[PDB]
């Protein structure tokens, strides 16, 4: 019976390929020919934030563009102050290995996870004057890679067990579970309308999900190797992905196809982080050449090369006001660019 | 006004306390060594862990007032190409391979080759722990299993002159075990720009001197790294 199913799957593949070909028109490059180049965007290290011992694996900003959270393999979760360049907290950790740190949208909780297969919730605005563990989410079988809050009580978490699940903090049970992938998912990025989320795995594909219905609306292909970082667009109609193939591509859900590719013949190492700007014109990426890069999203020319790190970069972040960019790297240092 | 001054003074005091605690933690974190245990199901990784003991599984032991930490990632799927990068700054890796069986020796060799040539693990040395010596000797001595069937190069190999067999031993088992070791050493010496080396050892089930071996290996690796950075041969 599986042979007949594969045959009709091939028929559906023919149909979808015909639709993709018929929906294609003149390339977006030919119409972007009329735009003017932006120029060389050069920014310097305004401040440096030292104090970490081991490498930095993740970083996330707050909602008021003042506080940021960092995670390291020592086991320290530090909350900094970008303006005064001084610390406010230092939470010890149980498991040293962590790949994710998150900040609540209202700035009351901070969550983290790693190889321990569990996600922890912390209390910041506590009345006892000390950070304590609130809940310990458990149930996944793979390692955690990315987790984000939704409003105050629901967190969407992705793991290497080929599945993504949504929890609720009050009772700690999986309300819904998504299973459409075949590799290991690594990234998440919630849409601005807070209705849909996209994911990317080690199968060179991206999946768009819906929280209530719980089904995969559409699937995108067009990459060779595994995907490492994903993001979103402020409009909510497009997103960009990075891969070990060392090329960046932009996908549009309205057209269900690919629009642009971002690569140069002199690059060998792959992308490790992607982060959009405020207006959506400046695209920032992180590579493994012990430096960073700046790209024009609408055009393709590489304009701007940040440098200063002694090891590979790990994280990238653009704040809500779009006034600073934070870059973390395995040299145990943090820098702020303006 | 004055309230703002009180606030920034309190913030500075918090910074001072946090910095002092961070310095205290840095004093301790730099004195403990970490090790990784990567092996196979047949290999007695749990057995050696238990010997030097007396999700991720930890274990503690200390020798000559030097602290040692080991890790065992034994709760994930088969794929390991992504979570193996989290051990980039680990002093050494302990590798356990079986020698009695011959079917998965090629798989073990492929694992070693993959580890030895990665872009984030080329500065990390390894410690071979060839195990199951009694089984290998008993099974080779009896017969009914020829190495030439699985490895058609045993006919052209001769015992090394530097070999030091245990005096109550038949030469054939020594030839076999040294051929097994020589294959791993041949994979090792092909690459490596004088930055990391592999230390071979022979280990059986009943062993009680395994901690000292890692002790001396770590000493050698530390001394080599220190000599490299001083431009002193």
């Amino acid at each position: 019976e599986l042979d007949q199913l594969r045959q009709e799957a091939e028929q559906l593949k023919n149909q979808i390929r015909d639709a993709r070909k018929a929906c294609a028109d003149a390339t977006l490059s030919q119409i972007t020919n009329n735009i003017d180049p932006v120029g060389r965007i050069q920014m310097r290290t305004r401040r440096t934030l030292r104090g970490h011992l081991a490498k930095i694996y993740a970083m996330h900003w707050g909602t008021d563009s003042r506080l940021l959270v960092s995670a390291s393999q020592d086991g320290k979760l530090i909350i900094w102050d970008s303006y005064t360049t001084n610390k406010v907290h230092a939470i010890p950790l149980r498991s040293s290995w962590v790949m994710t740190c998150a900040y609540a949208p209202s700035g009351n909780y901070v969550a983290c996870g790693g190889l321990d297969n569990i996600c922890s919730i912390y209390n910041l605005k506590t009345r006892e004057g000390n950070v304590r563990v609130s809940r310990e989410l458990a149930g996944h079988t793979g390692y955690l890679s990315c987790c984000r809050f939704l409003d105050d009580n629901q967190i969407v978490t992705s793991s290497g067990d080929t599945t993504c699940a949504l929890w609720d903090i009050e009772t700690g049970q999986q309300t819904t579970t998504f299973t459409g992938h075949t590799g290991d998912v690594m990234s998440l990025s919630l849409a601005p309308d807070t209705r849909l989320f996209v994911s990317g795995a080690c199968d060179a594909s991206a999946k768009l999900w819906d929280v209530r219905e719980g089904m995969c609306r559409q699937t995108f292909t067009g990459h060779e190797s595994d995907i490492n970082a994903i993001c979103f667009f402020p409009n909510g109609n497009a997103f960009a992905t990075g891969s070990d193939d060392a090329t960046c591509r932009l996908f549009d859900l309205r057209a269900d196809q690919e629009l642009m590719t971002y690569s140069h013949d002199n690059i060998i190492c792959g992308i490790t982080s992607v982060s959009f700007s405020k207006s959506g014109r400046l695209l920032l990426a992180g590579y493994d050449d012990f430096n960073c890069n700046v790209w024009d999203a609408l055009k393709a020319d590489r304009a701007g090369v940040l440098a200063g790190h002694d090891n590979r970069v790990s994280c990238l972040g653009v704040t809500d006001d779009g006034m600073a960019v934070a870059t973390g790297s395995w040299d145990s240092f943090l820098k702020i660019w303006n | 006004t004055e309230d703002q001054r009180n606030e920034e003074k309190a913030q500075r005091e918090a910074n001072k306390k946090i910095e002092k605690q961070l310095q205290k933690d840095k004093q301790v974190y730099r004195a403990t060594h970490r090790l990784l245990l990567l092996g196979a199901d047949n290999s007695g990784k749990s057995t050696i862990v238990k010997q030097m003991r007396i999700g991720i599984f930890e274990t503690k032991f200390q020798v000559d007032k030097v602290n040692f930490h080991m890790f065992d990632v034994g709760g994930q799927r088969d794929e390991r190409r992504k979570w193996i990068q989290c051990f980039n700054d680990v002093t050494a890796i302990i590798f356990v391979v079986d020698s009695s069986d011959y079917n998965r020796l090629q798989e073990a060799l492929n694992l070693f080759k993959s580890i030895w040539n990665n872009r984030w693990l080329r500065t990390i040395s390894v410690i071979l722990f060839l195990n199951k010596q009694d089984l290998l000797a008993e099974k080779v001595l009896a017969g009914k299993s020829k190495i030439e069937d699985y490895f058609p190069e045993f006919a052209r190999y001769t015992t090394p002159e530097d070999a030091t067999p245990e005096p109550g031993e038949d030469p054939r088992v020594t030839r076999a075990k040294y051929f097994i070791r020589d294959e791993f050493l041949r994979i090792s010496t092909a690459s490596g720009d004088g930055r990391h080396y592999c230390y071979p050892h022979f280990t059986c089930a009943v062993d009680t001197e395994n901690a000292r071996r890692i002790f001396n290996d770590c000493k050698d690796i530390i001394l080599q790294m220190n000599l490299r950075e001083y431009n002193l041969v």
């Epitope: 590799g183 060179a204 060779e224 190797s225 193939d245 | 190409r81 993959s114 990665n118």
Partner: nanobody, 126 residues
């Protein structure tokens, strides 16, 4: 999309010869390392042969050394595995796998329960 389709296969008495092939599309052939994987009943996946991008370094398993040989052709985008001096123990399903990372000399996985870049397989019976 990434697809890998194998070819060849049939009931051949010992002493026969077959030339297998895998057709690769959707990715640049010239910047990857390729291999062959077989699976016998009651057995796990095993590795057989490998070849670099140019075609300089060639290695085989100990089971087959002069019996089988491998070769590639960039212009036609297909890998070839020669088969000589067939034996009854060489009965399995053949996949033409590819290592994940580009411009590299080490590659993991290949032999796993569920890899990402592998074909459906071709059956050879002796």
């Amino acid at each position: 999309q990434v697809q890998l389709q194998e070819s060849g296969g049939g009931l051949v008495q010992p002493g026969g010869s077959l030339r297998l092939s895998c057709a690769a599309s959707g990715f640049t052939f010239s910047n990857y390392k390729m291999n062959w994987v077989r699976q016998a009943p009651g057995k796990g996946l095993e590795w057989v042969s490998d070849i670099s991008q140019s075609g300089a370094s060639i290695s085989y398993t100990g089971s087959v050394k002069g019996r089988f040989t491998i070769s590639r052709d960039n212009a036609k985008n297909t890998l070839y595995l020669q088969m000589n001096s067939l034996k009854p123990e060489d009965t399995a399903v053949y996949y033409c796998a590819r290592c994940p990372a580009p411009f590299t000399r080490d590659c993991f996985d290949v032999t796993s329960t569920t890899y990402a870049y592998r074909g459906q397989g071709t059956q050879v019976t002796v």
